[PDB]
Nucleic acid binder design. Structure first.
Ligand SMILES: C[As](C)(=O)[O-]
Ligand SMILES: C[As](C)(=O)[O-]
Ligand SMILES: C[As](C)(=O)[O-]
Ligand SMILES: [Mg+2]
Ligand SMILES: [Mg+2]
Ligand SMILES: [Mg+2]
Ligand SMILES: [Mg+2]
Ligand SMILES: [Mg+2]
Ligand SMILES: [Mg+2]
Length: 758
RNA sequence: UUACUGCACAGGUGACGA
DNA sequence: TCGTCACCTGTGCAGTAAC
């Protein structure tokens, strides 16, 4: 019946008395806040300046007096609540404001972890993990047309290495290459400094410097990254460092796991509710009960979408709750029509790895047998092919080569293909040490580039994967096979969808931001992905081949109008038919872009048909969490004491925050990885207010389904493929744009139906 | 770069207004 | 240029693979 949130009701006054000045230029605001400081809360909104009196006594303020009622204008007190929460928690210094964010005053988890594991080191006290709480006052709608303000509690961990760089050098951590940040953050200045090249007297030598090429040892510390933590502590702790991380994991789980998080939120509410919260001298707020999403009595705030069905035939008869279980039984969705039943696959690999690659290829093509039931059949039988023919392309290249690996791979590929006839796909095996080389000499990207140019999609793979123990390898090979099949134009599966209307197009856009280093400014690229409603299931459409960020809204507009035109020709819509277009992204579109997109599509389809249009943003990092106290979780593994996903809402749970907003649970206890995995965070789904199609519950469930459409993996994706695929495309095409001899010429020819971006 | 998941840090950025 | 509310994107490390 009920999903509990991480938020509490805030009992506010019905009305607050305010003073208003017209203030068209908002630049005067900062100085005016400063003048009236301590005595007035000041807030700029809609060309006017609102003043709420906090404390009797001057300065005085000229303006028009007005009663601001909370039910009608909750943004005023919501804003004041941001400041009042800080003032209500005086013993807690704000590490950030709006939302007020602060550290636990005592708890420090590295010390606690060292004690539980029985470790120690004279430098351990300089490594800190401190619980970090935030309090976000948020407007929500307990029912349509009525707003309220709630305070939402979130918890993270601050990682910080306060150790002097001098003390870390001795001994004997190699600080070279490590990123380093300012120790005191001057207001509005960058934290990042650069990487450590060397340290001498009192100065650090920086490369990839953000400003000055050197900084005093006293003004810099290591950035609190997991990388720096692991580098430092493994050097200091050696064999025992693993004991510390697992202990640290247990510690953090004591804050993050379902019942532990619910308890921590409970405890925070009790603390906040102990006294009134002072909105002004005269005016008090009161933190009340935990906010719930339920269906009682006038509220309709929670529902459970049905299980997504993975579908493997056009009749809908062959379906399954799980991708792999389904693919195992039925084979792929397009098995009866799949053209290339004898694919020829080029295999490019370092000559020294021959034996390992053959073992991998055999496992891949012919399976691992019934001792490894996750991948028994192998690619050929799995997909219902007749066979796979490998043309072996060894490369004389060693891992120690870091400057000429890519040229050796590409020369070998060119020489092999020149005499080998036609290949339909490639597998490229990479040394770990080459995987993350800069792009000008990175063999992943150069071989990707060359083969794509030639119209040959690739599935690449790093040697540590090639060398996985069999129990892990079987799962690797599931994901490898699915993506490879789709790279061969295959359609592994679809997801259930019933009719509803005459045609439905979903287009997504995704962003990548590329640079050669953290110091070089990131360049933006976009990708576009389309999905069509099919007979009884969704079908993946075509994909963008151009990636320029500038003019991206024209790109969306042209994609949609082009597609609508073709859909109409193809399907021959009858007068009165209804067509729906949905847009997905991780950010909202501009109102002006929505107007322009809606105008153009409406004009393109014309007046014979009805058109519905929705613009949706999918958010991951918001302050909302769902707790299902009825959920006991599952054993961490068969069949232990520990449980995983305790209190995790079922997948497909959808809660109403407001008219335009839903929370969508995606990670159920089954999908939750381990006992220490935190209570999952739902996706926030938000409808653009200018949308003409308004059913955000439908749109939330549609997003859920599209999460199951990913052919990169048997497990669902973190975000719908309309966005996810677009990000992968934008990143690849963005990187390829800088690789010499790259051409997109085959993306819409040989690769038009290839899912080359997986 | 089989992936999924989590987290951390860093960079900032988007949308709405006047 | 501004205020205001909000959260996105990149990178690296670790545990696990919906029955
Ligand atoms: C209907 As329910 C609160 O179990 O998602
Ligand atoms: C000690 As407390 C900030 O969780 O109330
Ligand atoms: C699949 As083979 C190259 O070991 O015959
Ligand atoms: Mg206090
Ligand atoms: Mg406790
Ligand atoms: Mg099998
Ligand atoms: Mg290697
Ligand atoms: Mg009508
Ligand atoms: Mg891939």
């Amino acid at each position: 019946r009920q999903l509990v949130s991480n938020g509490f009701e805030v009992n506010l006054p019905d009305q607050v008395e305010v003073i208003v000045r017209d203030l068209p230029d908002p630049s005067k605001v900062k100085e005016e806040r400063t003048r009236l400081m301590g005595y007035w809360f000041v807030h700029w909104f809609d060309g006017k300046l609102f003043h709420l009196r906090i404390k009797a006594g001057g300065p005085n303020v000229d303006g028009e007096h007005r009663a601001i009622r909370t039910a009608e204008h909750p943004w005023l007190l919501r804003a004041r609540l941001d400041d009042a929460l800080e003032e209500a928690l005086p013993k807690y210094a704000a590490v950030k404001k709006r939302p007020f964010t602060f550290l636990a005053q005592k708890d420090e988890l590295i010390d606690a972890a060292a004690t539980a594991a029985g470790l120690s080191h004279r430098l351990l006290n300089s490594f800190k993990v401190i619980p970090r709480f935030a309090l976000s006052p948020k407007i929500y709608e307990p029912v349509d047309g009525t707003t309220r303000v709630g305070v939402f509690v979130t918890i993270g961990m601050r990682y910080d290495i306060e150790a002097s760089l001098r003390d870390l050098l001795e001994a004997g951590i190699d600080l070279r290459g490590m990123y380093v940040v300012r120790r005191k953050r001057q207001p509005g200045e960058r934290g990042l400094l650069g990487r450590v090249r060397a340290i001498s007297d009192d100065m650090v030598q920086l490369f990839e410097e953000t400003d000055l090429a050197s900084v005093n040892v006293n003004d810099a510390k290591l950035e609190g990254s997991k990388e720096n933590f692991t580098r430092c502590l493994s050097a200091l702790l050696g064999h025992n460092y693993k004991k510390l991380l697992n202990a640290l994991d247990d510690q953090e789980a004591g804050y993050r796991t379902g019942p532990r998080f619910d308890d921590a939120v409970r405890r925070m509410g009790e603390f906040l509710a102990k006294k009134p919260i002072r909105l002004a001298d005269n005016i008090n707020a009161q933190v009340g009960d935990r906010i719930v999403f339920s269906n009682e009595g006038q509220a309709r705030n929670v529902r459970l979408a049905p299980k997504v069905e993975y579908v493997f035939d056009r009749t809908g008869a062959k379906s399954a709750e799980y991708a792999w279980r389904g693919l195992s039984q039925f084979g792929p969705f397009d098995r009866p029509s799949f053209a290339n039943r004898s694919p020829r696959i080029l295999v490019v690999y370092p000559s020294s790895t021959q034996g390992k690659v053959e073992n991998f290829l055999s496992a891949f093509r012919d399976g691992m047998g019934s001792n490894y039931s996750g991948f028994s059949k192998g690619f050929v039988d799995l997909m219902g092919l007749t066979k796979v023919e490998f043309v072996m392309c060894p490369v004389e290249v060693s891992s120690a080569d870091r400057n000429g690996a890519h040229t050796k791979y590409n020369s070998a590929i060119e020489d092999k293909l020149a005499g080998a006839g036609e290949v339909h796909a490639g597998i490229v095996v990479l040394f770990e040490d080459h995987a993350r080389l800069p792009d000008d000499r990175n063999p992943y990207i150069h071989t990707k580039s060359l083969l794509l140019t030639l119209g040959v999609p690739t599935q690449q793979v790093r040697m540590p994967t090639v060398l996985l123990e069999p129990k892990s390898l079987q799962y690797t090979l599931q994901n490898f096979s699915i993506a490879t099949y789709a790279k061969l134009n295959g359609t592994p599966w679809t997801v259930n969808h019933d009719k509803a209307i005459n045609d439905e197009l979903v287009v997504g856009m995704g962003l990548a931001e590329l640079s050669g280093s953290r110091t070089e400014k990131r360049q933006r690229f976009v990708g576009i992905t389309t999905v069509f409603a099919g007979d009884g299931s969704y079908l993946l459409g075509n994909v963008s081949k151009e990636c320029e960020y500038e003019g991206y809204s024209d790109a969306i507009r042209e994609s949609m109008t082009g597609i609508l035109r073709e859909l109409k020709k193809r399907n021959n819509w009858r007068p009165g038919d209804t067509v729906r277009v949905v847009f997905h992204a991780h950010r909202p579109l501009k109102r002006v872009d929505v107007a322009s997109i809606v105008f153009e599509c409406t004009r393109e389809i014309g007046s014979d048909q009805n058109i519905q249009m929705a613009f949706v943003t999918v958010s991951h990092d918001h302050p909302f969490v769902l707790i299902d106290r009825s959920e006991r979780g599952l054993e961490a593994y068969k069949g232990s004491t520990a449980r995983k996903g305790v209190f995790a809402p079922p997948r497909g749970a959808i809660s109403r925050v407001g008219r335009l907003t839903r929370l969508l649970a995606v990670n159920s206890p089954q999908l939750i990885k381990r006992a220490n995995t935190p209570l999952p965070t739902p996706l926030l789904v938000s409808l653009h207010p200018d949308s003409t199609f308004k059913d955000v519950d439908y749109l939330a469930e549609q997003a859920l389904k599209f999460t199951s459409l990913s052919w990169r993996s048997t497990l669902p994706a973190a975000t719908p493929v309309t966005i996810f695929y677009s990000e992968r495309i934008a990143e690849l095409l963005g990187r390829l744009k800088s690789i010499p001899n790259w051409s997109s010429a085959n993306l819409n020819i040989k690769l038009k139906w290839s899912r080359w971006f997986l």
